[PDB]
Amino acid sequence: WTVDDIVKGINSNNLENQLQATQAARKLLSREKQPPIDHIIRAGLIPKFVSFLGRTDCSPIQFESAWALTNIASGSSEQTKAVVDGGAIPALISLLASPHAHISEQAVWALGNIAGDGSVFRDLVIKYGAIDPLLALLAVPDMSSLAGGYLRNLTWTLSNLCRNKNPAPPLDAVEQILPTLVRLLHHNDLEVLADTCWAISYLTDGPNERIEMVVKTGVVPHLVKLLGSNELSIMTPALRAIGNIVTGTDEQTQIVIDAGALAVFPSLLVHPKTNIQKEATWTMSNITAGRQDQIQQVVNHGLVPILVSVLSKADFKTQKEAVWAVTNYTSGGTVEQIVYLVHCGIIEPLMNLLTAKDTKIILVILDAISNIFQAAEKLGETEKLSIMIEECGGLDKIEALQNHENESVYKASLNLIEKYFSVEEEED
């Protein structure tokens, strides 16, 4: 069939011809790689599919139209917008209540695509009342394999309803959705768990108010349990959610720590996947930016030597996150905690990173060195620390920084050199 034949059949008074034409259009959209989406939109068929969605007298044409609209809305933002401007959203929301499960689930998938296009269409799908019918579909006892696949479809759509920012999802909708996400987190299906963790991670990515919404439900312990998963598809979103949560207040970070997340981070800080490593090191840096009891928990879990290893031998992005972890540690830590950090061998890797080309990183490293020196002063071992820094080659790097183009670097390194490395002894 051609688009011309489809157009001729769809404007026919015979329902069977309309159905065959809709089947041909759906087959173009579902079976052809690089489908003719733009030609189909230019043919003006979107209003026709939206109209067929309401033909309860013929469920097949409903199914075919919902499928065609799904594949149209699965492309660019303008194609999804063509779907939205044709009036597809309310028709699909109403089709959610179709007695035939496959039709309702095709409507779920279509709405998921539309909402995944962006925050505007997401808020539109929410505004036309999709959440209640979707949750009604998600309250049914799913005990079959077909029910499992439909649950995957529904969870994916829900996660797209939790996604994107500027604006963030309306708070009323997020609170309407959260209980279902908490329930879904207790399923055994890996895809359902992954999609649910992704929804959680979306909801936690923002100001501390959204983190508080997620945390009050009580999911953090189960999020940590999933963080300990051997499935990367489940661990990755769970780690993103935990990381977002520890960017918040001290009490939210403490919720995460009491859930036992740190006990998983050894494995995460040496993970083969460099993205997982960088994410875990960033999370650790936000944890070491916390209270002294939280730094003490980082110490109790034996994570400091691991962080030294990462700072020493990891890729530069993970080394940058490790630099932030170290500087936050030495900014908020006790003298004993900073001494412990020194005994684990932080000086040489931290200092070797002063050859990096990132000026901000160099300033952060110099700030960490100053914190370490101030702890030493409190102990009266500033001289021993000076000798340590000199013997690992650190004095060379600080002196070289006194010739840096950036004046902040120059002033910082000069301050350190004038304060601890410009000593004069006149002994009798």
Binding site: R31, T70, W109
Partner: peptide, 22 residues
Amino acid sequence: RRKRKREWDDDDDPPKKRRRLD
């Protein structure tokens, strides 16, 4: 010092749209 919020990226952020094929 400071908590550092997440920076915009898509390391493995899920797919936004899916096409149904047969």
